[PDB]
Design a protein around this ligand. Sequence first.
Ligand SMILES: Cn1ncc2ccc(CNc3ccccc3[C@H]3CC3(F)F)cc21
Lengths: 280, 616, 1122
Amino acid sequence: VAEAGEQFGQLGRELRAQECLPYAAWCQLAVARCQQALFHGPGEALALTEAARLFLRQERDARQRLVCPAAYGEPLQAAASALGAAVRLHLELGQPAAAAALCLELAAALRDLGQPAAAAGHFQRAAQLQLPQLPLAALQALGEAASCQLLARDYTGALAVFTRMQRLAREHGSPAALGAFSDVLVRCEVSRVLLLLLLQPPPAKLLPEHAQTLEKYSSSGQLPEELFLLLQSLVMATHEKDTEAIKSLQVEMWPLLTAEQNHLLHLVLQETISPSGQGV
Amino acid sequence: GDWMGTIRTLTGNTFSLADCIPLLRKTLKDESSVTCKLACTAVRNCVMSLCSSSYSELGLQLIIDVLTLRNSSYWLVRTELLETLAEIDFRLVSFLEAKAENLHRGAHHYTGLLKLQERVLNNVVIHLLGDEDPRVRHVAAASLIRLVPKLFYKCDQGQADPVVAVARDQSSVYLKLTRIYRGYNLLPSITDVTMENNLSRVIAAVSHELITSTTRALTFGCCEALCLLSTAFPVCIWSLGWHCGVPPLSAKSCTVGMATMILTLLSSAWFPLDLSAHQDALILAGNLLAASAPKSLRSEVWPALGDRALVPMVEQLFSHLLKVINICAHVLDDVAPGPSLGSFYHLPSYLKLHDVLKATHANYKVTLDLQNSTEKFGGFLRSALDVLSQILELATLQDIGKCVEEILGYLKSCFSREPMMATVCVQQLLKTLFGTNLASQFRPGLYHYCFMAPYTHFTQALADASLHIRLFEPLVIKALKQYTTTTCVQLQKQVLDLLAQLVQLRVNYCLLDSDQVFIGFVLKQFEYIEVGQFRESEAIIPNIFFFLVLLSYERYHSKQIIGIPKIIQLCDGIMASGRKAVTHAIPALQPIVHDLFVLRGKELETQKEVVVSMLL
Amino acid sequence: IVRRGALILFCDYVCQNLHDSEHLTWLIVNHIQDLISLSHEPPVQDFISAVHRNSAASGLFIQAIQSRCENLSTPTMLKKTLQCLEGIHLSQSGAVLTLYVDRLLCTPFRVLARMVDILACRRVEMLLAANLQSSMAQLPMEELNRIQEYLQSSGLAQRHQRLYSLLDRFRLSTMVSPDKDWYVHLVKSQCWTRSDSALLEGAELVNRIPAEDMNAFMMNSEFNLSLLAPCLSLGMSEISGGQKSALFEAAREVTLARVSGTVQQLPAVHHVFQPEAAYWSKLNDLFGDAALYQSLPTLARALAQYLVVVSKLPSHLHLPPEKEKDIVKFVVATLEALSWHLIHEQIPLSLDLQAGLDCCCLALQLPGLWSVVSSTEFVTHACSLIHCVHFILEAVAVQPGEQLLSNPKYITAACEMVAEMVESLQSVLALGHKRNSGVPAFLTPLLRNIIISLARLPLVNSYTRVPPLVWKLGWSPKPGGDFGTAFPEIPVEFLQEKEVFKEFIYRINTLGWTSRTQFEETWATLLGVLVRTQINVLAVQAITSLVLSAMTVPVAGNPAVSCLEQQPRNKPLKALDTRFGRKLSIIRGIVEQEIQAMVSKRENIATHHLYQAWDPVPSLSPAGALISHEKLLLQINPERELGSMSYKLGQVSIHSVWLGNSITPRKHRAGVDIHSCSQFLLELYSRWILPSSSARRTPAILISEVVRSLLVVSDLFTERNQFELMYVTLTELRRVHPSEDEILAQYLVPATCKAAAVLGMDKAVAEPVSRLLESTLRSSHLPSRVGALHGILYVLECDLLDDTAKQLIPVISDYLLSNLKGIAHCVNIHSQQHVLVMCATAFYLIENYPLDVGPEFSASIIQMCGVMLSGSEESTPSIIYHCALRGLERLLLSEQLSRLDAESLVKLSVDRVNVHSPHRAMAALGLMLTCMYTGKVIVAMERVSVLFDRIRKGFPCEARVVARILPQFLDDFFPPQDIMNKVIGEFLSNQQPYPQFMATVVYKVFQTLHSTGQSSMVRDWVMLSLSNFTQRAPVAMATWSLSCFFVSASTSPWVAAILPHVISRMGKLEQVDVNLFCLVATDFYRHQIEEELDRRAFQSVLEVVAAPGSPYHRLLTCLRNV
Ligand SMILES: Cn1ncc2ccc(CNc3ccccc3[C@H]3CC3(F)F)cc21
């Protein structure tokens, strides 16, 4: 009966006014069970989302506000469980945008809490739910997934995601591109060049799309001309073995790059002077 | 310096303009919010004139220091900041940033760039759409629409640098050489690609905050911002600015933008219960679907739509509209929500919406303010009828033929509360029923801008210069009655437009006005219009003359109802008065001239000669 | 707008009036930069075209550019300049060639320097095509000499070779045996030149210099200081292999000598660096010297590489006490130099920021260097660190008009800056937070750890512990100590405010405690609050965190050095203590060390440095030092994500509680008595959760937070009576409390199981606990099921009764088989903590209960983990992939699996190496190696062909590692003759992306043939292969491949030592490359051949390719008089 659902609602509101977050969230789960018995799926998905927000708040107080070493993460498990249930509801209600929004909310919480590798999977789930109906939102979800994979140090997974983004942005944004998609294309292009200079694939791993990019730097289009000259100079200096060119370029490029791109250019110069995989 | 040297020799005063700016920079940091508000007002008075001067480094420094105020505890400091930042021209600020070498470093020797446009747009204007105060969200939404024309981005096809961008604006002013519903545009728009690029970036940033919003306040503020953008930069004119790729073409161009976000909000358990955010979402959903038109229209349900991917979206919006109009009809008739397409009793989210609307109208029933436009039940009903009127341009008799008896039932409940929009909705039903709606009737640089394009257009111009019908009766009868008992000229215009439409559909006027009472009353209004006693007559005149001119063709009712000789004697009777020609005589002549010369004899030649004697 | 527009209009005019040379001259002479800037405006392009159509105008245009070449040097202005010069008049070709060679060709922008080269080539080609009487009038011999002498003297002639050859063609139209002393000369030709190329190869060359000469070799002024960090890293790989490293001890003495010699150049008195006298003049003279400024980051890079290893060295290699003060002076001077450079000369190199911050981070972690900088003598140094770290943070992170958050006066500024920075760790320095998006990710871990260490200095610590709200509440005690900044601890009446208390808890949790006195003070303060339900809950959370902080390992109470103790449930594997197990531990240890570099979360590693992973596992005995990461190979708990150091349920195993405390069925740590703390809490909590009949009922939130606190602080319990009272209390609580509280159950169930497991799981305990576990696995609430699985894992450590195992194990096995099969095909849409703890439970049952869990269970679990591991990057997350795969390696290496289970893991391991992702392939390679060594034919030849394919298809990182392990794999599974053809073929193949990796594989394979007495076999394979080497298509790569081959084949120790030099010169064909090739081929011919029929065969192969002047013709000329 709905009267139990309103009483659990009142108990949740009062417990939230007392900062009793786990029991306020437990009351919202009791509302979701009342909505399920009434077959009110929209109300159930609402009740589950509010339960998850109270658990995410409890986790943020433990790991962000207080930095407790005893925080092993039990309210994040409760939050992710309730979000997954609300996503499952929105998908059978035929609402992939609401399902994507709850994936982005979990992905954001996981990224903030120091779990980028888990956040990248939820950002890619959001992109796939969005893509057939919201291409530009899906590109915004892939951009966060790439950002997470660089924080997780999965450079080849980031190279794959930026390559998917640039293909999607040409397909949905077009040789000139519309304002929002053009900004996606410039980010992908600069990040992919730096990742190809970091990763240095053999001819077995140069895709047509990767070779087609490195030919362009061996005509700036959407890139600003000064950055395009500096990137062409960096591709030449790394195809030579000119450490003093790469050093002098890194100082000229610093104001023009994002912090994520300045980290990529640091990794290129580091991998050039002290290569990975030698055990020294 | 030349002006200051003159006043210094005349007065002996040692004062300098550079001595003022430190006092603004001090008072922006005052402990009192009222000092801080007044200091923000003082920056609003001078910041753009400073950027336009040899002190333009100080103008740039005031823009940097005022951005602190976004975190203020007082809402009037937040709205003064928004109104201040809306005055700024970012083409000019991008020029000042590009010449700065010390100001990017500031205090503490920073190593990046100022990025002032990104900080204003994202960290202030789009951030304050999430404010818990709706007064702040409204000013943030209004400030964003003022910014779109004035943003600058690199690599733009129309303006490669900020000096070319400032020269376009300065040149564009001084070197300047049936009827479809409000959201439709069938002609190929010619658009500034730079504006369409700016609009694309703004809509992408606001729709990102919408889909990622974790608070009700930010969802509501993003809807308000997108609704007002879709009004100021119409989706049907600016379709590549609105486009997110959803219809897979131009990805003469058309779009539905992000309509799937908005329809998902309209079916949520929470979002429909805020009446202001709900009514913004209806208007935006109507505008987004109407901007598909000539590409989505054909060459079965909704048979006019060849783009079958939009049919679920149109059915969803249309069925939502019928339910929320039926809720308003129940609230106005004071009928309890219990015992076809507008049925809502079995849907708990619509029962919550009913109780919000009932409570809003209960406060209206016990109060007597009649000037307030911000009344939420009336605003909501008006927005739902407006969007239904918009969606009826895509309908056919096969879509409405099961609904028309139902909708006219709801309009009879709603007519007393929103008579003007109920009359518009009747007109769109008549267009859909009779088959007269849209569904049925279907490298640049300084040399270019500062001289060469202006001179090319001027020289080319000098070169060319050398060369179911019975169901409608009680609503038409309500409209004819209320015209005689109202002082709302906006309703009176709309009833004359309904009657003009009935006459053009060849409905017999002797069925509508058998006893001649309506023509008699319309003619008796001219006494009060001529002597200056009919308030807002300037609104009603052109509709009266268009209507009487149509009545001049109906000779076959045994006798002519009025005739051009009487319409001409009414027209110069206005013209002979002390009332201003532009609001009175000219609007009376325009219906007459197009009829007598464009559309339409031994009498007719004399009438044309008499009208030319009035034009002279 | 007017300035630009009026030039455009005046150009449009002059193009219609080209007779009027006065206006053309005035435009060129006074507005050249504006013509070049505006060259894309159509009238300006037409004007430049008219200047190209006129000889005198083109001469004015060139002379004007010469007068502005200190400008015209920004990349886009230089590009526009060359685009103007491209079309210029034929009669001005010598003048523009001069402008190219003596100004524009000197430029640092690499793409623009090739445009100058290409254009200069085109203009000298025009001068060769024109009639010579004109061309020598354009270029006098007294100019033609200058440009060539400059091209040689500036070193451009070895970069712009075509241009110099065209100037040569134009002027012609007008007018030895290898030993120690050879080896030391080869290494000084690479190691006594300033460069940052081939540093890993350069360290390997210095390592083969005799130990007597290394100190003199590294102390010479010419020695490349960039080799010190490589040498320390390479020598640490020898120390950690159980050898003495002569190179490490040489590099240590040279690093400390150069650090001391740099400090001896600073002023004799130190003043605090402030970003806002003669001392500052001395610093401008020191830091403005390009030699001294380049010396600081390069010595800092070596110092950091020594400091990051120092606590793991032999005791004679630790810091000399006499050099601790000089190290602190040097580390301070390096941040002052980086800060001075940021003020005067833009952002430093990222590697140079990193080296300064690495030294600062590592020097604050070591207790000796910490004891110096926390002293009163070092107050100005401590203030300079704080000023420089705050300055560098704002210069990177904070845009102008923003701010970070939104006594001598330098002392007070230092306090406020450290307090502002400690709050920034919530936002600006939180990795992946929205406020961190302006900090590049190489700076965030360094700055976090530096700030936590600076907040612990006696100078600023007590100030930083005061909540900022309490200064706003007007609190105003007079400070007093050696520095004048010792504030008292916050009065307990302020901590009655919720937000003041949240701010206090954050600071004590972030900073930890500096002594047992500060621990006892914060213990007293928190009990003063603990004696409103929200303040009691926060006090229970705070006291829990305080008691748990004593469990942090190498230095308790210090978050900058230490993380929480782990005592893993899994034992050492006896299979490793065998002939094949010891060889597996080497090869698998190479792979594991690279998986740690690629995938580890790195929570306990602040500094950049690969190969620095450690786990917080003490050597445990009844009552030590940390067990090395190479001894915990498959010991760390399966449910812990790699390199995560946070608290988890299962942190400390039941066997470790029994062993360390002797309670089978440490009490003082950092001088804190954790027994009196944990005994006081156990007594206090036992009264609150079982209240008397007259007391008011305890809030449910407080009951749940107290039972959570018991679950956590029971890791510090030391006596059976503590677990007995815990068990009795929680048992009575479960009897009186309402059973539907799934918010309590998630703590109560793990806690009851843990206490029952320590008490030894006897019949009166075990039946209640089994009934609690079986019912909790049916909960609606997932955290409580995860709690039941951790409870199940605690009870599985006991010697259970048969009648409790027969009851319990079927239920656990059913739950695991019902839940894993439903999720294994789509793991990403399910809770990762649920999947990880299920897999850990299944793997513990298969290893420890293989007779009670049915034979279908082991097969079914391996089949489902195979379905997870076969999923795509999106479908199976990387955390589940790596944790399942290390669990399966443990299963196989434990020897409890059947031969059919092992064969199914073989089929899995081989498929999983064939993936795009390098870290997933590297882990699957660990499983395949585990399968092959525990397995001790045509099968092995397939397995080696997977490794050769991973070198050919792989990224350089994965290919390098596969090439490091491959030599031992060949020696362990094959007679040399079976694989010798593949080894030489995969070095020669034109499909090989990495000849430089394979050169070391060929070398190691030929060295094991010499050490095993098979020196008769290397000559068979050199003589057999020589024909195929002469068929390498580029003669440079053919000559180089033979150079590697003869270096690999040689018995001579000094020729065998030069392989890194040969590898560093790949694809070069200079005179020194041909000279070396001839010598290493001569060594093979004089010593490895003796038979006259093989001397004939050797010369007969070279004759097929010995065209005149070729390196082969030089070699036959060298051989034919031996
Ligand atoms: C802010 N807020 N407050 C409550 C609440 C509940 C769910 C969501 C998730 N988002 C969503 C849920 C249902 C329907 C639509 C959407 C939007 C993505 C979109 F479609 F624009 C947000 C919420």
